[PDB]
Amino acid sequence: EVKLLLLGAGESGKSTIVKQMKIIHEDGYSEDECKQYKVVVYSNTIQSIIAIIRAMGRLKIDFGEAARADDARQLFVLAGSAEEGVMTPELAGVIKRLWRDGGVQACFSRSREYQLNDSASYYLNDLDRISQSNYIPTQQDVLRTRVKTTGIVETHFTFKDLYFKMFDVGGQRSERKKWIHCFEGVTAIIFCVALSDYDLVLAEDEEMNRMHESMKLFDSICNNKWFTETSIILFLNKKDLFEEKIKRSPLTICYPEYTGSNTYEEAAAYIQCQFEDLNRRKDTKEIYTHFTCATDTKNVQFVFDAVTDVIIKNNLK
Amino acid sequence: LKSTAKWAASLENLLEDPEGVKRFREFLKKEFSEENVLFWLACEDFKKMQDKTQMQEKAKEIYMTFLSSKASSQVNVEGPHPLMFQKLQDQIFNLMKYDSYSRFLKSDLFL
Numbered sequence: 001e002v003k004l005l006l007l008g009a010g011e012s013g014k015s016t017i018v019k020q021m022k023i024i025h026e027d028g029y030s031e032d033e034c035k036q037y038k039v040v041v042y043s044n045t046i047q048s049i050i051a052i053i054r055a056m057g058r059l060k061i062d063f064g065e066a067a068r069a070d071d072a073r074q075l076f077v078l079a080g081s082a083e084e085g086v087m088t089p090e091l092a093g094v095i096k097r098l099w100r101d102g103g104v105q106a107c108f109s110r111s112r113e114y115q116l117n118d119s120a121s122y123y124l125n126d127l128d129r130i131s132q133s134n135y136i137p138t139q140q141d142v143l144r145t146r147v148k149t150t151g152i153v154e155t156h157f158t159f160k161d162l163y164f165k166m167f168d169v170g171g172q173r174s175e176r177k178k179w180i181h182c183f184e185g186v187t188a189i190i191f192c193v194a195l196s197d198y199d200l201v202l203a204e205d206e207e208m209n210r211m212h213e214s215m216k217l218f219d220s221i222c223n224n225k226w227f228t229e230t231s232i233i234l235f236l237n238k239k240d241l242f243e244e245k246i247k248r249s250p251l252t253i254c255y256p257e258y259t260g261s262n263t264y265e266e267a268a269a270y271i272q273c274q275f276e277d278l279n280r281r282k283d284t285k286e287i288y289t290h291f292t293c294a295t296d297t298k299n300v301q302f303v304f305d306a307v308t309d310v311i312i313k314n315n316l317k
Numbered sequence: 318l319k320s321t322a323k324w325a326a327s328l329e330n331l332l333e334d335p336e337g338v339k340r341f342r343e344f345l346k347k348e349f350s351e352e353n354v355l356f357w358l359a360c361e362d363f364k365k366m367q368d369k370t371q372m373q374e375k376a377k378e379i380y381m382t383f384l385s386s387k388a389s390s391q392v393n394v395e396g397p398h399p400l401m402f403q404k405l406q407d408q409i410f411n412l413m414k415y416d417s418y419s420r421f422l423k424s425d426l427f428l
């Protein structure tokens with residue numbers, strides 16, 4: 001039996017990993033189970049396009065065309081229309097026209113300045129498929145959904161003759177006070193970091209850089225006396241988003257001492273070291289680090305197989 | 318029979334039925350997220366009251382129990398007068414709706 005904690009700051013991808021455990025080591029999602037996410041895809045898709053449009057008002061970005069102002073109004077009129085899981089063709093059209101607009105796209109490019117779901121562009125670029133009356137979300141759609149976790153949620157699965165008790169937790173500051181409840185006898189901790197957060201700011205404090213928050217948190221967890229004998233795994237997640245972002249946005253936003261080049265390979269290396277240097281007991285302890293795309297099942301399957309082999313190694317000693 | 322069927326339709330239905338609220342409280346206790354419903358019920362109380370002095374004390378009291386960074390039951394919200402907590406109440410409502418309520422309906426407590 002193995003007690004596994006999923007920890008990390010909010011939106012680092014813990015719940016996405018939990019879903020992957022169901023996909024890989026339970027039975028996948030059934031069609032009915034996928035149908036239950038339909039409402040969540042639509043809400044995520046609507047709230048994303050709305051967030052962008054409110055941002056335009058704050059940031060003072062005009063629409064590429066005047067007619068979109070009417071589309072904007074109609075968006076809010078129909079915003080609650082999808083709560084029973086139906087996107088009317090009227091609503092689909094409004095969202096299509098808004099998303100195509102040059103002004104909306106200019107605001108989306110500035111997302112860094114406000115709070116926006118990572119999956120926004122994924123749904124919005126796939127609106128035709130998502131819009132159909134017959135629409136059944138795919139496993140990728142479900143993995144892409146955003147639903148803020150509150151509390152502690154226990155899950156069971158089996159892999160290589162081991163019974164995993166796994167704990168998913170909320171990562172926002174408020175939720176962290178509850179973590180102490182399941183710290184006893186922890187076999188392994190998977191700590192998730194959103195690589196793509198390097199230039200973003202916290203949802204709970206618009207002045208604090210998300211990565212620095214994540215490092216402070218990892219510092220606390222990593223060196224905690226509860227986890228002296230715990231295998232500590234680091235998931236530098238969202239590598240896919242990080243790869244697109246590092247071309248556009250310099251890492252010096254986050255680490256102003258960085259003198260290296262703004263390229264996936266160097267930037268990622270630098271981040272890894274920053275986190276691993278927070279290990280105080282380097283003589284004793286080791287961090288097992290993997291670059292993950294949580295929403296990618298083949299990637300998560302490979303990474304978790306390696307993690308499991310490490311756990312097996314460290315429970316002979 | 319009818320009572321359980323109505324709780325499955327929406328969180329609104331669950332939170333209006335006081336027996337529904339009891340069973341849901343019991344579920345949140347197990348997941349360490351009971352502060353959410355308590356905070357929500359507190360806001361519904363706050364709305365109803367008209368006495369300016371009874372309102373000012375309760376507004377402070379809701380802030381210290383649920384909203385302060387030092388608060389023991391701090392609610393996970395995306396950081397006087399009756400409807401002053403609307404934004405926040407709606408946020409916690411949606412947190413429950415898409416997350417813990419979703420799991421509640423799959424639970425033994427319900428089935």
Ligand SMILES: Nc1nc2c(ncn2[C@@H]2O[C@H](COP(=O)(O)OP(=O)(O)O)[C@@H](O)[C@H]2O)c(=O)[nH]1
Binds near residue numbers: 145146149192237
């Ligand atoms: N593109 C991409 N999206 C991800 C990745 N990991 C998580 N997400 C998405 O980011 C959002 C936050 O994930 P979530 O698991 O809820 O974060 P949590 O608060 O730590 O549990 C969700 O919409 C996920 O689908 C990733 O590696 N790549």
Ligand code: ALF
Binds near residue numbers: 011
């Ligand atoms: F930390 Al989260 F949903 F934001 F699990």
Ligand SMILES: [Mg+2]
Binds near residue numbers: 014015016148149
């Ligand atoms: Mg989560």
